Write a structure and sequence with these properties.
Blueprint: E1 6-8, E2 14-18, H1 29-37, E3 41-44, H2 54-57, H3 62-78, E4 84-89, H4 91-100, E5 108-111, H5 120-137, H6 142-152, H7 160-171, E6 181-186, H8 196-203, E7 209-214, H9 227-238
Parallel strand pairs: 2-3, 2-4, 4-5, 5-6, 6-7
Antiparallel strand pairs: 1-3
């Protein structure tokens, strides 16, 4: 169905949930529903250019998506939730780490966050596959999709280099994170370099750093078979955080 930002109201423990590149809030909705059933207040913004036709994605970049992340953090603050944890999938996990050394965060849970850059061509191939599937889900025939993709291929995404610079910049500041960190990484991730999980765990400078590998999951770990175990592991980590004060 339709993708939209969601806010699940619960107690004073607040969690900011961040989806990945070419994703949407549905990637973190089941996790937000589980945490809200456990009493957490959950808010998931939707990045600019996501949840809309892919032609609008081409005009957006990390500077737009980061503004959506900060707006989500400030929305929870403006609503009375001063204590916020950050949990994100892939690029959302990168944004979660960036929040860790930028604003007060009770704890961060980067899930399959890439610390290694990929080539623009490799990234753009994923954009093209996302664009083709989006038009497929719009109900268009195969012939109409081929015609629209032919024009789509003539419009390169000029913000992919900035996306590379974002991942490289966060990796150089991982040692400035002192908040508790729960690194979640699927072992059979064919989308990123799984050594990113070791970089985050080894170089974060917090006393409470954790790493768990998921042996039966792919990159989309929140949608794969172990997600119920992931929900419990994330919940049980969030419970150890220094809430209230």
């Amino acid at each position: 169905v339709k993708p939209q930002p969601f806010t699940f109201k619960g107690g004073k423990k607040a969690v900011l949930l961040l989806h990945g590149f070419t994703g949407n809030t549905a990637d973190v909705r089941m996790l937000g529903r589980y945490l809200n059933e456990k009493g957490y207040t959950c808010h998931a913004p939707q990045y600019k250019g996501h949840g809309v036709p892919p032609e609008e994605l081409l005009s957006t970049g990390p500077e737009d998506w980061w503004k959506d992340v900060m707006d989500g953090y400030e929305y929870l603050k403006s609503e009375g939730y001063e204590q916020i944890a950050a949990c994100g999938l892939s690029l959302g996990g990168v944004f979660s780490l960036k929040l860790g050394y930028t604003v007060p965060i009770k704890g961060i849970v980067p899930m399959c966050a890439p610390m290694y850059i990929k080539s623009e061509e490799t990234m753009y191939e994923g954009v093209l596959d996302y664009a083709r599937n989006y038009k497929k889900f719009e109900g268009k025939t195969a012939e109409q999709i081929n015609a629209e993709m032919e024009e789509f291929k003539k419009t390169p995404m000029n913000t992919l280099k900035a996306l590379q610079d974002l991942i490289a910049d966060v990796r150089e500041h991982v040692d400035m994170i002192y908040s508790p960190t729960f690194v979640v990484q699927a072992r059979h991730d064919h989308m990123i370099n799984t050594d990113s999980a070791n970089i985050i765990y080894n170089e974060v400078e917090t006393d409470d750093k954790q790493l768990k590998w998921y042996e039966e999951s792919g990159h989309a770990i929140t949608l794969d078979k172990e997600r119920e175990t992931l929900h419990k592991d994330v919940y049980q980590f969030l419970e150890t955080l220094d809430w209230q004060t």
